[PDB]
């Protein structure tokens, strides 16, 4: 009895994308990113910015029809770190807190069978 959409939480470092779509994913409903809630420019990946974005999607999730959501948590993937960013748990928790119903949580990070030499050179990023 509840309308289902997709969450598609792309929590990288340097930013978090909270981007709700319909079941097919062709159209989008309230793509809000952590960097348009803060102005710190270094807190875009913060859990606070993710929580504000995840409340903004819930605000647009009502009065548009969607009531329950399928969670697709995503890291940067590919040849980058492919571990979720700091804001992923906060975005999902705020979605759960904001009355949106939750089902089918899955990790959809792009994982390669080895391909495409990683950035950084042979000796690494030297700090």
């Amino acid at each position: 009895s509840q309308v289902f959409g997709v969450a598609r939480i792309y929590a990288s470092f340097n930013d978090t994308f909270v981007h709700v779509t319909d079941l097919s994913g062709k159209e989008t409903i309230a793509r809000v990113t952590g960097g348009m809630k803060v102005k710190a420019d270094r807190d875009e990946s913060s859990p606070y910015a993710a929580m504000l974005a995840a409340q903004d999607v819930a605000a647009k999730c009502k009065e548009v029809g969607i009531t329950a959501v399928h969670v697709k948590i995503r890291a940067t993937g590919g040849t980058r770190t492919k571990t979720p960013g700091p804001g992923g748990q906060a975005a999902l928790r705020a979605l759960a807190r904001s009355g949106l119903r939750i089902g089918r949580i899955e990790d959809v990070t792009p994982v390669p069978s080895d391909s495409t030499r990683k950035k950084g050179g042979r000796r690494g990023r030297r700090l």
Partner: protein, 63 residues
């Protein structure tokens, strides 16, 4: 104004660069099944009541 009144039930530890912040666990007065970990500046006992301007953030600087 949505100010949240929370009762501390546990002091997790003394955090901060200089050790000036306390890690505490607080449950809510209106519903005692809404526990959350927060950062407190001043000195705290158990069974003390705090006021939360925003009631949704988890305190970092754990373990």
């Amino acid at each position: 104004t949505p100010v949240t009144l929370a009762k501390v039930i546990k002091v997790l530890g003394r955090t901060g660069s200089r050790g000036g912040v306390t890690q505490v666990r607080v449950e809510f007065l209106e519903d005692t099944s809404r526990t959350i970990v927060r950062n407190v500046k001043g000195p705290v006992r158990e069974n003390d009541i705090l006021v939360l301007m925003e009631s949704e953030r988890e305190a970092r600087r754990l373990r």
